[PDB]
Amino acid sequence: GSAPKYIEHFSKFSPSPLSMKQFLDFGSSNACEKTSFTFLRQELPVRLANIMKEINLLPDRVLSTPSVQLVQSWYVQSLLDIMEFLDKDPEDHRTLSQFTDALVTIRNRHNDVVPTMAQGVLEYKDTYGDDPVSNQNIQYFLDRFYLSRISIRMLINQHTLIFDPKHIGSIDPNCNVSEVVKDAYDMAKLLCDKYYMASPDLEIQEINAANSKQPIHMVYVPSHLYHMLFELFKNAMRATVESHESSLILPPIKVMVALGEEDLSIKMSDRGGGVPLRKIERLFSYMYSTAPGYGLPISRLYAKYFQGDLQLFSMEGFGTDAVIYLKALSTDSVERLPVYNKSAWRHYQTIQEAGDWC
Amino acid sequence: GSAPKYIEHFSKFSPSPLSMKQFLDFGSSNACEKTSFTFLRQELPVRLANIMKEINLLPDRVLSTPSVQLVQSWYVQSLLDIMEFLDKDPEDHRTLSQFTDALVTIRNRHNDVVPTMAQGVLEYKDTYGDDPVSNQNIQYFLDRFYLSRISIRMLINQHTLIFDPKHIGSIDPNCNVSEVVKDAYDMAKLLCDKYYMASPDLEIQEINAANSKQPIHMVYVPSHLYHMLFELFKNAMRATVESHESSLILPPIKVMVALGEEDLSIKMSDRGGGVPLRKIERLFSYMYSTAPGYGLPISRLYAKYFQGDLQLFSMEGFGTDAVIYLKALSTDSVERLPVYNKSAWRHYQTIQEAGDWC
Ligand SMILES: CC(C)c1ccc(COc2ccc(CC(=O)NCCN)cc2Cl)cc1
Ligand SMILES: CC(C)c1ccc(COc2ccc(CC(=O)NCCN)cc2Cl)cc1
The missing domain is CATH 3.30.565.10 (Histidine kinase-like ATPase, C-terminal domain)
Structure with missing residues (x-):
């Protein structure tokens, strides 16, 4: 019963963007997976928490929908799955091995995030309508959410594919x-x-x-x-x-x-x-x-x-x-990468009703 | 000493957008200029006032610059020039004639608005800098100001060219x-x-x-x-x-x-x-x-x-x-056409300092 705490903790951190150059390094050939494990133990929770903090900032009429609560639960579970390694130590070729296993399982768990979230959009359209302001918020949130996901999947794929060369x-x-x-x-x-x-x-x-x-x-x-x-x-x-x-x-x-x-x-x-x-x-x-x-x-x-x-x-x-x-x-x-801020907090305050042009 | 009053009065009105179809009508062939005179007596002051109200909403460091005060004075003068006809009556082929004269003179008066305002931008860049938020506000204001001007010049050209055919x-x-x-x-x-x-x-x-x-x-x-x-x-x-x-x-x-x-x-x-x-x-x-x-x-x-x-x-x-x-x-x-609103009022409240992406 401590997911909210973790989310609050790691959401205080800013995700660290890697360059294509850095990716080549982390993947080098011999750049041990220990370096990747220690980095990912912190980075994944940061990225997961950041998007989770934003999801919880959605209107209750959106949050309580079955779809959003379902993926919000996959994220919670994925977060706890990774926590399990914070107080673990590399060196043990079993710790690293079960970490890889952990990532693949997380990856599968999230395989249907896109269609699942799409189901939430259809529900919202019929439950509340398709006004321009609803379109703008959906557009704002989904671009960030999906982009965040794309990056998490990148990190994970890099680790699993390499720690299993042109x-x-x-x-x-x-x-x-x-x-x-x-x-x-x-x-x-x-x-x-x-x-x-x-x-x-x-x-x-x-x-x-x-x-x-x-x-x-x-x-x-x-x-x-x-x-x-x-x-x-x-x-x-x-x-x-x-x-x-x-x-x-x-x-x-x-x-x-x-x-x-x-x-x-x-x-x-x-x-x-x-x-x-x-x-x-x-x-x-x-x-x-x-x-x-x-x-x-x-x-x-x-x-x-x-x-x-x-x-x-x-x-x-x-x-x-x-x-x-x-x-x-x-x-x-x-x-x-998208980040949780008061800057992002204020992007959901749209109170449209009469524009600046006529 | 009543320009501010007029601006306040006519700024309460919303400019009326005309269609290319309506333009053909107003210009018909015999559609008297009386109809055009009575329409323009109200419309021009509305458009002038609307953009003038917005200009006065600019920061004092921008307002007090010689350039902005100079064109702001052309607009004031142009507004008063047209007022002169509100309590005048068509039928008198002299009232209409001096109205046309009035428009051409206004047109000339504003001939150098673009370069003059450009001088204000250069001044601002060296006086305060070229940060992204300054760029955004300048961009926001100039698009509206110039577009508003383009439309006023349209109305005026239509009237003067026609009331002097394929x-x-x-x-x-x-x-x-x-x-x-x-x-x-x-x-x-x-x-x-x-x-x-x-x-x-x-x-x-x-x-x-x-x-x-x-x-x-x-x-x-x-x-x-x-x-x-x-x-x-x-x-x-x-x-x-x-x-x-x-x-x-x-x-x-x-x-x-x-x-x-x-x-x-x-x-x-x-x-x-x-x-x-x-x-x-x-x-x-x-x-x-x-x-x-x-x-x-x-x-x-x-x-x-x-x-x-x-x-x-x-x-x-x-x-x-x-x-x-x-x-x-x-x-x-x-x-x-752009219009003065609380919607437009809030577009100059940018308080940037740390974005939503990292
Ligand atoms: C299923 C997912 C993709 C989904 C579906 C639908 C939505 C809709 O999200 C909205 C709709 C309206 C408003 C404005 C408002 O009135 N805000 C105040 C609300 N208290 C804000 C948001 Cl974040 C988001 C995400
Ligand atoms: C000469 C013309 C084209 C010109 C030149 C320069 C500008 C610059 O206008 C700005 C600059 C910064 C801000 C943010 C701010 O700090 N606002 C609060 C200010 N009290 C608002 C505005 Cl409207 C406009 C028009």
């Missing part, structure tokens, strides 16, 4: 962007053909500004890149196919990979008919995009995770451009 | 977008050749979704469209020329004009080398873009004026895409 856990220090683009395209095409029995082709072009014909590589988490590209290819294919089911030409999806001094950008262009500017804004909203998925908003979080971004801009009547912005340098790739 | 004042009910694109390009090219003795060519392509090969036309204020396109062509040319002064190929600027069910979009693509994502954000800031111009931020206001927008997205190492979003239908083209 790849350093989920990080590829020599990630060939175009290869990941093709992979995601191929998967999307497979699905596209099963459902539409037709699919647009792919054209890839890259611009290595400083080194003209040298293949573009970067230090990154390939699965994160795959997730984003896969989501974008799915929308681009669907839009292209549906907007041309009475035409016979099916234009290709053109992708450009540009490497600049600090940006490594990936544009995916389609001639899927485009979308009116006003609906674009709703495509990234968890609420407005829930019924009766969250691919875009969540993909954007993965991009923001390492100081990148993901933006959309179409031309109604023509097509849409989707761009993924990543940091080209490993030195600029540092975790973007 | 054009209805500054509005062309049959504006051929591509023709305006070429015009702006031609002017930019002229300047570009004088300074660089080299300039990229132009390629225009349009997509009329519902009517394939029919020229794209719209009801709009062509000079507003010209201003935006001219600003964008200048940046695209400069970037293209400078990023290739050691190459001999000079790629063209490609412009697409797409007409959708509700959007009429204009994309201007250049291979000017692009800009890193982090600097893009600063390109629209009045403060960060002041030294020791305001083309982009102000052009964006002209687009927002009739419910449109103007966005930028480049690929560092390659080029930049600039898109102007306009409403395709005259029914959706309604003035976007």
Whole structure:
């Protein structure tokens, strides 16, 4: 009966963002897991507590819903699971071993957090409505919550994958962007053909500004890149196919990979008919995009995770451009993490009722 | 000695946004200027007072600067100039005539508002610094102030131009977008050749979704469209020329004009080398873009004026895409105006000092 105490304790700490460079170190090759165990024993509780403190700051009509209470219980359990190691000592190759076991079990426990929370949004929409202010708070909270989760899963995956070499856990220090683009395209095409029995082709072009014909590589988490590209290819294919089911030409999806001094950008262009500017804004909203998925908003979080971004801009009547912005340098790739503050406390005080424009 | 009273009086009123449809009516052909005079006698004071009330809400260290006090005096004078007609009666073709005179004189009086206010920003940067919160408030205030001005100038131009026919004042009910694109390009090219003795060519392509090969036309204020396109062509040319002064190929600027069910979009693509994502954000800031111009931020206001927008997205190492979003239908083209409220009052209460992210 001491979860609230712990949450209060660790919530007093600020999570420590790691750089892609630091990740390579922690994963080195021989950088013992002792260092990782001692670091994670403190860091995970800090991150868990921080987002838990914020969850408890939600309105009671949101808090008492079955969904929020359910995941709030997974977090509580996960927190206690890790506490068990604070007064334990490395050196014992059994302490470390059961810690890894502990992490995998925590990971599984949280496997369905996204859909579970999505169920809370649907419930709220029918129980209280879909006004702009509700959309803003949901958007504010879910971006932080999901981003926080993405980072906890990163730490955990890094530890379990390494303490089980060219790849350093989920990080590829020599990630060939175009290869990941093709992979995601191929998967999307497979699905596209099963459902539409037709699919647009792919054209890839890259611009290595400083080194003209040298293949573009970067230090990154390939699965994160795959997730984003896969989501974008799915929308681009669907839009292209549906907007041309009475035409016979099916234009290709053109992708450009540009490497600049600090940006490594990936544009995916389609001639899927485009979308009116006003609906674009709703495509990234968890609420407005829930019924009766969250691919875009969540993909954007993965991009923001390492100081990148993901933006959309179409031309109604023509097509849409989707761009993924990543940091080209490993030195600029540092975790973007949310933190509990009075700054964040005041972001849920929206008392809207008549704007500043007419 | 009753300006403060008037400001207080008319600031209690909300400015009335007109639609492109209503503008055509007020300008009809025979829609007497009496209707325009009686409407403008009330509307101009309302708009003037609203922005004046907000100006007086600025910090004293900003208010007392010579620049802000100077334009604040032009507004005061302009307000009193119009008051003179409240208790006057139409029917007298002299009352109306001196009203038109009154408007032109007001227009001239305010001709240098932009640079004058820009001088206030430079002063503030050196007198107090360029912190993010100062940038945010300047950005907040100038967008509203300038947009308010753009709308007052619209009303005035409509009245003076008409009450001096295919054009209805500054509005062309049959504006051929591509023709305006070429015009702006031609002017930019002229300047570009004088300074660089080299300039990229132009390629225009349009997509009329519902009517394939029919020229794209719209009801709009062509000079507003010209201003935006001219600003964008200048940046695209400069970037293209400078990023290739050691190459001999000079790629063209490609412009697409797409007409959708509700959007009429204009994309201007250049291979000017692009800009890193982090600097893009600063390109629209009045403060960060002041030294020791305001083309982009102000052009964006002209687009927002009739419910449109103007966005930028480049690929560092390659080029930049600039898109102007306009409403395709005259029914959706309604003035976007700022209003004085407690909603706007609370937007200047920023007390930043430690954010919500770490
Ligand atoms: C299930 C999850 C994703 C979920 C679903 C729904 C929500 C809704 O959250 C809201 C809604 C309205 C307000 C304004 C207000 O009136 N605040 C004062 C309340 N006392 C604040 C919040 Cl935090 C959050 C999270
Ligand atoms: C010349 C024009 C364009 C100009 C130049 C400069 C500015 C700067 O305006 C600021 C700066 C800081 C703050 C926060 C604050 O501390 N507020 C409390 C102040 N009592 C509020 C405002 Cl409105 C506005 C307009």
